[PDB]
């Protein structure tokens, strides 16, 4: 009888936690074809989302158990289409690129003065854009764990050559 459990955290595998699990003599662990430990338990001091994957042990081989890490939205950046240089009177679309697990439930958009703007989706269409709308904008993601902020990405509105 060979298998693996997640002793040490109740559940709720979040990136700040010190995670663990033990195999139930000569111990061996394995992830992605490489052995990561010869002890009975394979433990982490601070879990990172890339530590997530399918692990296995053998003392005869265990069956694959998938480690899943939940984390607040990270690496948020405001993309702009067609770009950050849009002519006045046309469209400027702001996309809040995100990476989270579970994915972002709702977004929140702000301007340079940290005033919330009435939009909740991942993409925000400004139309028609005005030269007064030139300035810094940033979004915010939210999920089960926490929040995530994006840096100030500015959009420039230029007049038309007439």
């Amino acid at each position: 009888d060979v298998r693996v459990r997640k002793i040490k955290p109740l559940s709720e595998i979040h990136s700040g936690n010190s995670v663990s699990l033990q195999c139930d003599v000569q111990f061996f662990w394995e992830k992605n074809g490489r052995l990561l430990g010869k002890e009975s338990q394979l433990n982490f001091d601070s879990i990172s989302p890339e530590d997530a994957g399918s692990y296995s042990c053998w003392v005869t081989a265990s069956k694959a158990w998938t480690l899943e890490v939940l984390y607040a939205p990270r690496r948020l950046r405001v993309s702009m289409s067609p770009g950050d240089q849009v002519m006045e009177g046309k469209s400027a679309t702001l996309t809040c690129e995100s990476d989270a697990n579970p994915p972002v439930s709702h977004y929140t958009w702000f301007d340079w003065n940290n005033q919330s703007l009435p939009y909740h989706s991942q993409k925000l269409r400004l139309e028609p854009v005005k030269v007064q709308h030139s300035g810094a904008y940033w979004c915010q993601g939210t999920n089960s764990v926490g929040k995530g902020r994006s840096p100030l990405s500015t959009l420039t509105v230029y007049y038309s050559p007439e």
Partner: antibody
Framework: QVQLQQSGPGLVKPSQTLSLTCAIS??????????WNWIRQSPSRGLEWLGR?????????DYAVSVKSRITINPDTSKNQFSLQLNSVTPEDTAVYYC??????????????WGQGTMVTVSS | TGDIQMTQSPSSLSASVGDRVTITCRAS??????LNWYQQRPGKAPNLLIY???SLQSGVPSRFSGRGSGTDFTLTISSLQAEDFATYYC?????????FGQGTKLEIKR
């Protein structure tokens, strides 16, 4: 108590431009926690959102693509109103036009205060 | 994917006073809990009944209730009253343009 009062001509000749006004009581059009919309209703098509104007640090506008070419929603800070202008009207534009306050919270986003409505007929 | 389209069911229903009635609203794309329910009595503007899928607006009787998130929602009148004769609409506020359902006409048998 927040109330919205509508006014404007209910008979517009074809190819001419509709113009309505929604007066605000108990609130300001420059409210950073709200947005001021226009919604039309007809038995032909039902309720259709037309556009809105709101102020945060600048004045912004969101428009339905149906009327993007003809719609214009400008606020009035001195009289605490916001307008609706629709150029080159057709008999298809005959409908009841509502103004409404949109409470724009982070999680609550609804039209809670509505105007009484203004029936507009496009006819010669 | 485009504009979010709301479809209500049924388009019309008949019920007697005191009956339990439910109105379903489905969104073509997920809107989480950015859904609103309105009541339009004859000759009147739409009235906000429920916002954020499940929260009752001030003044609305307790017989109205909302439920759901994502793409499928439900408006419930536990004990129908004669005053509830109206058309009911669902509306999403998650994405611009905001869109309404086609409405549900509620007629009272007596």
């Amino acid at each position: 108590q927040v109330q919205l009062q509508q006014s404007g001509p209910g008979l517009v000749k074809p190819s001419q431009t509709l113009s309505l006004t929604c007066a605000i009581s108990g609130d300001s059009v420059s409210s950073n926690s709200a947005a001021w919309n226009w919604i039309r209703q007809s038995p032909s098509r039902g309720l259709e959102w037309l556009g809105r104007t709101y102020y945060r640090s600048k004045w912004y506008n969101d428009y339905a693509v149906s009327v993007k070419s003809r719609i214009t929603i400008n606020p009035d800070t001195s009289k605490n109103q916001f307008s609706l202008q629709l150029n080159s009207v057709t008999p298809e534009d005959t409908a009841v036009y509502y103004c409404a306050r949109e409470v724009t919270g982070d999680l609550e986003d609804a039209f809670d205060i509505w105007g009484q409505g203004t029936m507009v007929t496009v006819s010669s | 994917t485009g504009d979010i389209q709301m479809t209500q069911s049924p388009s019309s229903l008949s019920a007697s006073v005191g009956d339990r009635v439910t109105i379903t609203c489905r969104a073509s794309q997920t809107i989480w809990s950015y859904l609103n329910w309105y009541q339009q009595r004859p000759g009147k503007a739409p009235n906000l009944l429920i916002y954020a899928a499940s929260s009752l607006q001030s003044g609305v009787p307790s017989r109205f209730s909302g439920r759901g998130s994502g793409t499928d929602f439900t408006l419930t009148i536990s004990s129908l009253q004669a005053e509830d004769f109206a058309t009911y609409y669902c509306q999403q506020s998650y994405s611009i343009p905001q869109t309404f359902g086609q409405g549900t006409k509620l007629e009272i048998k007596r």
